[PDB]
């Protein structure tokens, strides 16, 4: 819910900064000349920064071993094979690359195999000034890295085409992350509309990071890959370690847990890594099955849960959800629905960005200037 | 990978544990380059076969080079 | 507005479950062997479930009718045509398929013609254990079905490439759906900022379904196709039939209609299936034209409406909207703007997730502990 | 934040209207015949409107200069080259086009070079009945125009394939736009949770337009291109010029500036065109660096700012942001944090869609029926 | 392009100025067309080489024409 | 298809009727497969023409097979 608390960056500012620089008159030449006839340079610029350069395709020094080697037996005749083959394809790359920039007005992502071949990528990764676990990680997950990379068209000039490539740095690795799922919790009692709900708004991915915790509110800005979690910090908050306390004890004095109130008791499910939360309310039909032998459990109104051991699938209302078949150990932790601790008479049924204790203050306010302005009379 | 999860009936919520980070903290730029000849229209009439074909893979080529020129002198749209 | 009430699923859990299974040592072979030299199997697994299998491309038994049939007259010579042709293309497919998985890190949608050819698709649809109207529907809308399908890379192994394909089931068909559009309704009176608005938050698609109604809050998770509506229940709520009552009578005792209050009177339009709602407020220029002979109507402040008979286009402020030219019968239903029933003095001008009667309780609260704590004094 | 105030249109209603028309029996022929053997027609329809028509590819009158010119020396023999070449490619286009419509169920965007070649595009732009600055603009930004264009599959019929192409009109050009960035402003004082925030909700792009101002709340529905801003009015509001007053004076009597309150003091950054806003709160580490010589400034709690002169990069918490290297003149305007003017004791800490003066009324309400019902006692 | 920006410490906000509009206000429709022959299965057996190849670029062609027919008679999904 | 709509002036709202459902309620999985040879580097020098070409459509082929191997052993990103 809390994605509106995020800051706002400029994903390709890094990359463009370098593009911008490639229009300085001296620069373009400094580059070509530095790849005199090497293929990986390290040209420091006339801005004054180091950029691993890279000629990946020589077409000038190919065409010019068959412009003059064919502007003579032609016009006209034939030459042979091999030369067609090894150009049809050589040129073809460029054509793709040109398609790609033209449709995405000069900026592509993911970065394609044409823009950078595994060949060329892994090599880049190898001489990147960065740790060794970074290297291995990147190498075993190239199609992800490609997804988090950008490619930025920069210049076509005399006899040279430059485009910048922006690649991720994984400055944080092998720290423990964890994922928090939350459905709404309401009172079950019978009169339709007599009922109060509350939800934890703090759902997301959470990863330990430099003594704090990076929190990712919109959990589809992260890709799990087995048990690795690729996130981007551009979409994160930096919170105290204490924020975990909300899971064992949502009332704790150390961190003030975040919630949302409403009166809107509606049935829904949340599928977890290894199970399924069910919020059943009203006249809803909520169920959990095994594909083979059908319904194996029927939920009562309120918020409950099942693991994916034995369960394939869960229906709530007319909504069937397949469960995640990942393997692991679930543990149910019985506890009193905290919503049962609140007097409906003085409960804030409209609160989108609130905390546990904000609700409390707001209650005391109500409670006090009820009871006082009352025995008064 | 020992992945594991707990449901809290108190607060209708659940935590999945046992995951390992990989966070994009920074960026690695690097220029990628391609060298190009420019050539005239100087060509031919003919021809036997395997240069009527090599001429076609060359219409396309300048065609490309033309579009890339269209992307002239501006900030790219992020 | 109400999309935040949705649950949260795992769209490809079904599919992946099967992928996971294809790494059991016995399984991969059980498959190849079961397609001994048939092309559509039904291998039950060493998990124990039935999956229509499908070899769609034999390259081993092609390459091995020109490895040995060409590792002999070569090295070196030539063979002929036909064999190049019917491989250049045969291989080409695979290359596409490989592109597709590499860019989308192993998961594609829509499912492409390379991943599955109409040829192969329709055949699949034919032997799918499902009703006959399903079959016809799917067949007449393949490019939609492709859109709602997923394709999941699973394994490359010894001499075999397996990827799972997840295809929709349309378990609900030919029931009546209907679409609800809502713009904000405010008071028109003159002092800028003296004014109160209210909007129905319950907009979306609505379809009758097993005695209840599936409700789709974000109506771009549905594609109309003529007069068929393809939705996905994964993004729906299951509500009482009574919820329709809100259209004839928003005050009705049976279902408690949902709204949102604010003081933010701003001009806007909503284009309907067959017309256009206009919310005109303040100094805004709101108009409806015929392309040919220009402006044919000028709106007064407040919320009004026009059908697409005669009208091509509607401008509100500096925003031109083309109207939907679909053919049908509109009917205007004159009624008193309910916002005219509310005393501005005790109206909740900030409420994002509220109902008609929630507003009422909140009013009585205000009304009472005004009048009581007042004659008091 | 305010994107929920937008209206809702039907982006391709214009285009489809014309598609619909191409199924009138008389129409399809009226078209083919009107391109007797011209390539750009202007067929007025049997609905009765003018549409620049365009045959871009003749395959009938190509195949029929090698059906009969090859159903005779074959069966069977060979013909030559050139004819293969100039068809392999001619046909190839169509194949792309067919891919494109099949995956996007008949509606593509951006409009591809196959759907329309620069060749054909610019020609279209040339004979478009529109001003000359429009023409030049469109011509220098074709890959943007392609992005804002749509292409709508319409009919395959006897010997003819018609698809409609919807192209932008830039009816507003060279007026001054400007971009507003806003981070949250809170009180800094020490007890965690004793603290109140407020944010301007009115962020977006703003462009002068016909005496009013078009406002674009979700500023990623706009693409800057150097110092040109392409927006689409479909996602805009039409507001009074006065709305600018909120920047110099947020208290001004003429326009009532929009804000949001909360108690949720969290650290974040907003990267501007030429700098970076920092909202530092709590125990957060907020900093600004120069890549070369490291940290050059450390922020105090509260809301501050730095220009991109000298600064490359800014970190807030565990979130590094590269700054925009665009060149220009920043100016810091020192001012008292307005949040310092509010008594925390009677401040509305939950308000998502509010104004400066709405807060004031709500305060007076609190202030009054405190002080009155108090000396009372 | 004289681009310029002001930060307001009062209200934690900033304005970037010096930009020029280009707003999509309207739309230009226009039909684009392609003519097609339909032909029989009438063909050949053979052949030397450069018609075994021209036949293949023609499987694809009807193949296409088939898919385009599948997109039969309906409102397109916007 | 008799499509029809009513505007409610009372509540600034409208309902379009006359539509027919097609709802995705469930899923149909099914494995799709492709058989592959693996071969050595054993090849040739030569050649006349139409095997210098068949060798190229085979670089690409293993190239592919290589990328598909890179997608090694993990949960796919949904």
Coordinates of N, CA, C and O in Angstrom, one line a residue, chain D residues 244-360:
Chain D
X244 N -0.4 28.8 -10.5 CA 1.0 29.0 -10.3 C 1.3 29.8 -9.0 O 2.4 29.7 -8.4
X245 N 0.4 30.6 -8.5 CA 0.6 31.4 -7.3 C 1.1 30.6 -6.1 O 1.9 31.0 -5.4
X246 N 0.6 29.4 -6.0 CA 1.1 28.4 -5.0 C 2.6 28.2 -4.9 O 3.1 27.5 -4.0
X247 N 3.4 28.7 -5.8 CA 4.8 28.5 -5.8 C 5.5 29.6 -5.1 O 6.5 29.4 -4.4
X248 N 5.1 30.8 -5.4 CA 5.6 32.0 -4.8 C 5.0 32.1 -3.4 O 5.6 32.3 -2.4
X249 N 3.7 31.9 -3.3 CA 2.9 32.1 -2.1 C 1.8 31.1 -2.0 O 0.8 31.1 -2.6
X250 N 2.1 30.1 -1.1 CA 1.1 29.0 -1.0 C -0.1 29.4 -0.2 O -1.0 28.6 0.0
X251 N 0.0 30.6 0.4 CA -1.1 31.0 1.2 C -2.1 31.9 0.5 O -3.3 32.2 1.0
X252 N -1.8 32.3 -0.8 CA -2.5 33.3 -1.5 C -4.0 33.2 -1.6 O -4.6 32.0 -1.8
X253 N -4.7 34.3 -1.6 CA -6.2 34.3 -1.6 C -6.9 33.9 -3.0 O -8.0 33.6 -3.0
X254 N -6.1 34.0 -4.0 CA -6.6 33.8 -5.4 C -6.8 32.3 -5.8 O -7.8 32.0 -6.3
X255 N -5.8 31.4 -5.5 CA -5.9 30.0 -5.7 C -5.6 29.2 -4.4 O -4.6 29.6 -3.7
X256 N -6.4 28.2 -4.1 CA -6.3 27.5 -2.9 C -5.5 26.2 -3.0 O -6.0 25.1 -3.5
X257 N -4.2 26.3 -2.6 CA -3.2 25.3 -3.0 C -3.5 24.0 -2.3 O -4.2 23.9 -1.3
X258 N -3.1 22.9 -3.0 CA -3.5 21.6 -2.5 C -2.4 20.9 -1.8 O -1.2 21.0 -2.2
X259 N -2.7 20.2 -0.7 CA -1.8 19.5 0.1 C -2.4 18.2 0.7 O -3.6 17.8 0.6
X260 N -1.5 17.5 1.5 CA -1.8 16.3 2.1 C -1.1 16.4 3.4 O 0.1 16.7 3.5
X261 N -1.8 16.0 4.5 CA -1.2 15.9 5.8 C -1.0 14.4 6.2 O -1.6 13.5 5.7
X262 N 0.0 14.2 7.1 CA 0.2 12.9 7.7 C 1.1 13.0 8.8 O 1.8 14.0 9.0
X263 N 1.2 12.0 9.7 CA 2.2 11.9 10.7 C 3.4 11.1 10.3 O 4.2 10.7 11.1
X264 N 3.6 10.8 9.0 CA 4.5 9.7 8.6 C 5.8 10.2 8.2 O 6.1 10.1 7.0
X265 N 6.6 10.7 9.1 CA 8.0 11.3 8.7 C 9.0 10.2 8.3 O 9.7 9.6 9.1
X266 N 9.2 10.1 7.0 CA 10.1 9.1 6.5 C 11.0 9.7 5.4 O 10.6 10.6 4.7
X267 N 12.3 9.2 5.4 CA 13.2 9.9 4.5 C 13.2 9.4 3.1 O 13.0 8.2 2.8
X268 N 13.4 10.4 2.2 CA 13.2 10.1 0.7 C 13.8 11.2 -0.1 O 14.1 12.3 0.4
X269 N 14.1 11.0 -1.3 CA 14.6 12.1 -2.2 C 13.8 12.2 -3.5 O 13.2 11.2 -4.0
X270 N 13.7 13.4 -4.0 CA 13.2 13.7 -5.3 C 14.2 14.3 -6.2 O 14.7 15.4 -5.8
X271 N 14.5 13.8 -7.3 CA 15.5 14.2 -8.2 C 14.8 15.2 -9.1 O 13.7 14.8 -9.7
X272 N 15.3 16.3 -9.3 CA 14.7 17.3 -10.1 C 15.5 17.4 -11.4 O 16.5 16.7 -11.6
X273 N 15.0 18.3 -12.2 CA 15.5 18.5 -13.6 C 17.0 18.9 -13.4 O 17.8 18.3 -14.1
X274 N 17.2 19.7 -12.5 CA 18.6 20.2 -12.2 C 19.0 20.1 -10.7 O 19.9 20.8 -10.3
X275 N 18.5 19.2 -10.0 CA 19.0 19.0 -8.6 C 18.3 17.9 -7.9 O 18.0 16.9 -8.6
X276 N 18.2 18.0 -6.6 CA 17.8 17.0 -5.8 C 17.2 17.6 -4.5 O 17.8 18.4 -3.9
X277 N 16.0 17.2 -4.2 CA 15.3 17.5 -2.9 C 15.6 16.4 -2.0 O 15.6 15.2 -2.3
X278 N 16.0 16.8 -0.7 CA 16.1 15.8 0.3 C 15.1 16.0 1.4 O 15.1 17.1 2.0
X279 N 14.4 15.0 1.7 CA 13.6 14.9 2.9 C 14.3 14.0 3.9 O 14.1 12.8 3.9
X280 N 15.1 14.6 4.8 CA 15.8 13.8 5.8 C 15.1 13.8 7.2 O 14.8 14.9 7.7
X281 N 14.8 12.6 7.7 CA 14.1 12.6 9.0 C 14.6 11.4 9.8 O 15.0 10.3 9.2
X282 N 14.5 11.5 11.1 CA 14.9 10.4 12.0 C 16.4 10.1 12.0 O 17.2 11.0 11.8
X283 N 16.7 8.9 12.2 CA 18.1 8.4 12.2 C 18.7 8.2 10.8 O 19.7 7.4 10.7
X284 N 18.2 8.8 9.8 CA 18.6 8.4 8.4 C 19.9 9.1 8.0 O 20.2 10.2 8.5
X285 N 20.7 8.3 7.2 CA 21.9 8.9 6.7 C 21.7 9.5 5.3 O 21.5 8.7 4.4
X286 N 21.7 10.8 5.2 CA 21.4 11.5 4.0 C 22.6 12.3 3.6 O 23.0 13.2 4.4
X287 N 23.0 12.2 2.3 CA 24.3 12.7 1.9 C 24.2 13.1 0.5 O 23.4 12.7 -0.3
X288 N 25.2 14.0 0.1 CA 25.4 14.3 -1.4 C 26.9 14.2 -1.7 O 27.7 14.8 -1.1
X289 N 27.2 13.5 -2.8 CA 28.6 13.3 -3.2 C 29.0 13.9 -4.5 O 28.2 14.3 -5.3
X290 N 30.3 13.9 -4.7 CA 30.9 14.0 -6.0 C 31.6 12.6 -6.2 O 32.4 12.2 -5.4
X291 N 31.3 12.0 -7.3 CA 31.9 10.6 -7.6 C 33.4 10.6 -7.3 O 33.8 9.7 -6.6
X292 N 34.1 11.6 -7.7 CA 35.5 11.6 -7.6 C 36.0 11.7 -6.1 O 36.5 10.7 -5.6
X293 N 35.7 12.8 -5.5 CA 36.2 13.1 -4.2 C 35.2 12.9 -3.1 O 35.3 13.5 -2.0
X294 N 34.3 12.0 -3.3 CA 33.4 11.5 -2.2 C 32.3 12.5 -1.7 O 31.9 13.4 -2.4
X295 N 32.0 12.4 -0.4 CA 31.0 13.1 0.2 C 31.3 14.6 0.4 O 32.3 14.9 1.1
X296 N 30.5 15.4 -0.2 CA 30.7 16.9 -0.1 C 29.7 17.6 0.7 O 29.8 18.8 1.0
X297 N 28.6 16.9 1.2 CA 27.6 17.5 2.0 C 26.8 16.4 2.7 O 26.4 15.4 2.2
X298 N 26.4 16.8 4.0 CA 25.6 15.9 4.8 C 24.4 16.7 5.3 O 24.5 17.8 5.8
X299 N 23.3 16.1 5.1 CA 22.0 16.8 5.4 C 21.6 16.7 6.8 O 21.7 15.6 7.4
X300 N 21.0 17.8 7.3 CA 20.4 17.8 8.6 C 18.9 17.3 8.4 O 18.4 17.5 7.3
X301 N 18.3 16.8 9.4 CA 16.9 16.5 9.4 C 16.1 17.7 8.9 O 16.5 18.8 9.1
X302 N 15.0 17.4 8.2 CA 14.2 18.5 7.5 C 14.3 18.3 6.0 O 14.9 17.4 5.5
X303 N 13.7 19.3 5.3 CA 13.7 19.2 3.8 C 14.7 20.3 3.3 O 14.5 21.5 3.5
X304 N 15.7 19.8 2.6 CA 16.7 20.6 1.9 C 16.9 20.2 0.4 O 16.2 19.4 -0.1
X305 N 18.0 20.8 -0.2 CA 18.1 20.8 -1.6 C 19.5 21.1 -2.1 O 20.2 21.9 -1.4
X306 N 20.0 20.5 -3.2 CA 21.3 20.8 -3.8 C 21.2 20.8 -5.4 O 20.4 20.0 -5.9
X307 N 21.9 21.7 -6.0 CA 22.0 21.6 -7.5 C 23.0 20.6 -8.0 O 23.8 20.2 -7.2
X308 N 22.8 20.2 -9.2 CA 23.7 19.3 -9.9 C 25.0 19.9 -10.4 O 25.8 19.1 -10.9
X309 N 25.3 21.2 -10.1 CA 26.6 21.8 -10.3 C 27.4 21.2 -9.1 O 27.1 21.4 -8.0
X310 N 28.4 20.3 -9.5 CA 29.3 19.8 -8.5 C 28.9 18.4 -7.9 O 29.7 17.6 -7.5
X311 N 27.6 18.2 -7.9 CA 27.0 17.0 -7.3 C 26.6 16.0 -8.4 O 25.9 16.4 -9.4
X312 N 27.0 14.8 -8.2 CA 26.7 13.7 -9.2 C 25.6 12.8 -8.7 O 25.0 12.1 -9.5
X313 N 25.4 12.8 -7.4 CA 24.8 11.7 -6.8 C 24.4 12.1 -5.4 O 25.1 12.9 -4.8
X314 N 23.4 11.4 -4.9 CA 22.8 11.7 -3.6 C 22.4 10.4 -3.0 O 21.7 9.6 -3.7
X315 N 22.7 10.1 -1.7 CA 22.2 8.9 -1.1 C 21.3 9.3 0.0 O 21.6 10.3 0.6
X316 N 20.2 8.6 0.1 CA 19.3 8.7 1.3 C 19.0 7.3 1.8 O 18.5 6.5 1.1
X317 N 19.4 7.1 3.1 CA 19.4 5.8 3.6 C 20.3 4.9 2.8 O 21.4 5.2 2.5
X318 N 19.7 3.8 2.4 CA 20.5 2.8 1.6 C 20.1 3.0 0.1 O 20.1 2.0 -0.7
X319 N 19.7 4.2 -0.3 CA 19.2 4.4 -1.6 C 20.0 5.5 -2.3 O 20.0 6.7 -1.9
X320 N 20.8 5.1 -3.2 CA 21.7 6.0 -4.1 C 20.9 6.5 -5.3 O 20.2 5.6 -5.9
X321 N 20.9 7.8 -5.5 CA 20.2 8.3 -6.7 C 21.2 9.1 -7.5 O 21.9 10.0 -6.9
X322 N 21.3 8.8 -8.8 CA 22.1 9.7 -9.6 C 21.2 10.9 -10.0 O 20.1 10.8 -10.3
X323 N 21.9 12.0 -10.0 CA 21.3 13.3 -10.2 C 21.2 13.6 -11.7 O 22.0 13.1 -12.5
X324 N 20.3 14.5 -12.1 CA 20.3 14.8 -13.6 C 21.3 15.8 -14.0 O 21.3 17.0 -13.6
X325 N 22.2 15.4 -15.0 CA 23.3 16.3 -15.4 C 23.0 17.4 -16.4 O 23.8 18.2 -16.8
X326 N 21.7 17.5 -16.8 CA 21.3 18.7 -17.6 C 21.9 20.0 -17.0 O 22.1 20.1 -15.8
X327 N 22.1 21.0 -17.9 CA 22.8 22.2 -17.5 C 21.7 23.4 -17.3 O 20.9 23.5 -18.2
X328 N 21.9 24.1 -16.2 CA 21.0 25.2 -16.0 C 21.3 26.0 -14.7 O 22.2 25.6 -14.0
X329 N 20.5 27.0 -14.4 CA 20.7 27.8 -13.1 C 19.6 27.4 -12.1 O 18.5 27.7 -12.3
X330 N 20.1 26.8 -11.0 CA 19.3 26.6 -9.8 C 19.3 27.9 -9.0 O 20.3 28.6 -9.0
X331 N 18.3 28.1 -8.2 CA 18.2 29.1 -7.2 C 17.4 28.6 -5.9 O 16.3 28.2 -6.0
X332 N 18.2 28.7 -4.8 CA 17.6 28.3 -3.5 C 16.8 29.5 -3.0 O 17.3 30.6 -3.0
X333 N 15.6 29.2 -2.5 CA 14.8 30.3 -2.0 C 14.5 30.1 -0.5 O 13.5 29.4 -0.2
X334 N 15.3 30.7 0.3 CA 15.2 30.4 1.8 C 13.8 30.9 2.2 O 13.3 31.9 1.7
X335 N 13.3 30.2 3.2 CA 11.9 30.4 3.6 C 11.7 29.6 4.9 O 12.4 28.6 5.1
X336 N 10.7 30.0 5.7 CA 10.4 29.3 6.9 C 9.5 28.1 6.6 O 8.5 28.2 5.9
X337 N 9.9 26.8 7.0 CA 9.1 25.7 6.8 C 7.7 25.9 7.3 O 7.5 26.0 8.6
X338 N 6.7 25.9 6.5 CA 5.4 26.3 6.9 C 4.8 25.3 8.0 O 3.9 25.7 8.6
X339 N 5.5 24.2 8.1 CA 5.0 23.2 9.0 C 5.2 23.6 10.4 O 4.5 23.3 11.4
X340 N 6.2 24.5 10.6 CA 6.5 25.2 11.8 C 5.4 26.2 12.3 O 5.4 26.6 13.4
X341 N 4.5 26.6 11.4 CA 3.4 27.4 11.7 C 2.2 26.7 12.3 O 1.2 27.3 12.6
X342 N 2.3 25.4 12.5 CA 1.0 24.6 12.9 C 1.2 24.1 14.3 O 2.2 23.4 14.6
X343 N 0.2 24.3 15.1 CA 0.2 23.7 16.4 C -0.2 22.2 16.2 O -1.3 21.8 15.8
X344 N 0.7 21.3 16.6 CA 0.5 19.8 16.5 C -0.6 19.4 17.3 O -1.2 18.3 17.0
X345 N -1.0 20.1 18.3 CA -2.2 19.8 19.1 C -3.5 19.7 18.4 O -4.4 18.9 18.7
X346 N -3.6 20.6 17.3 CA -4.9 20.6 16.6 C -4.6 20.6 15.1 O -5.1 21.4 14.3
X347 N -3.8 19.6 14.7 CA -3.5 19.5 13.3 C -4.0 18.2 12.7 O -3.9 17.2 13.4
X348 N -4.7 18.3 11.5 CA -5.2 17.0 10.9 C -4.2 16.0 10.3 O -3.9 16.1 9.1
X349 N -3.7 15.1 11.1 CA -2.7 14.2 10.7 C -3.1 13.1 9.7 O -2.3 12.2 9.4
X350 N -4.4 13.1 9.2 CA -4.8 12.2 8.1 C -5.7 12.9 7.2 O -6.9 13.2 7.5
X351 N -5.2 13.2 6.0 CA -5.9 14.0 5.0 C -5.1 13.7 3.7 O -4.0 14.1 3.6
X352 N -5.8 13.0 2.8 CA -5.1 12.7 1.5 C -5.4 13.6 0.4 O -4.6 13.8 -0.5
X353 N -6.5 14.3 0.5 CA -7.0 15.2 -0.6 C -7.5 16.4 0.0 O -8.7 16.6 0.2
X354 N -6.6 17.4 0.2 CA -7.0 18.5 1.0 C -6.3 19.7 0.4 O -5.5 19.6 -0.5
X355 N -6.7 20.9 1.0 CA -6.1 22.2 0.6 C -5.6 22.8 1.8 O -5.9 22.4 3.0
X356 N -4.8 23.9 1.6 CA -4.3 24.8 2.7 C -5.4 25.3 3.6 O -5.2 25.5 4.8
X357 N -6.5 25.6 3.0 CA -7.6 26.4 3.7 C -8.6 25.5 4.2 O -9.2 25.7 5.3
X358 N -8.9 24.4 3.5 CA -9.5 23.2 4.2 C -8.9 22.8 5.5 O -9.6 22.5 6.4
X359 N -7.6 22.7 5.5 CA -6.9 22.5 6.8 C -7.3 23.6 7.8 O -7.6 23.3 9.0
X360 N -7.3 24.8 7.4 CA -7.6 26.0 8.3 C -9.0 25.9 8.8 O -9.2 26.0 10.0

